[PDB]
Amino acid sequence: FVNQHLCGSHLVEALYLVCGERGFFYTPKA
């Protein structure tokens, strides 16, 4: 479900499902 254009909340949502109990870091201004 990740091989598509993921923007905004749609992206943050994917990182959450994928990273799991590891967590992740969202940086749009990188």
Partner 1 sequence: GIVEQCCTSICSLYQLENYCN
Q: What does the binding site for partner 1 look like in residue numbers (CB under 8 A)?
A: 2-8, 11, 14-15, 18-20, 22-30
Rounded to a whole number of angstroms, the minimum distance from the CB of residue 20 to partner 1 is: 8
Rounded to a whole number of angstroms, the minimum distance from the CB of residue 21 to partner 1 is: 10
CA–CA separation, 29 vs 21, rounded Å?
A: 24
Rounded to a whole number of angstroms, the minimum distance from the CB of residue 5 to partner 1 is: 6
- Residue 11 is given by DSSP the state H
* Contact predicate 9/17, CB 8 Å: no
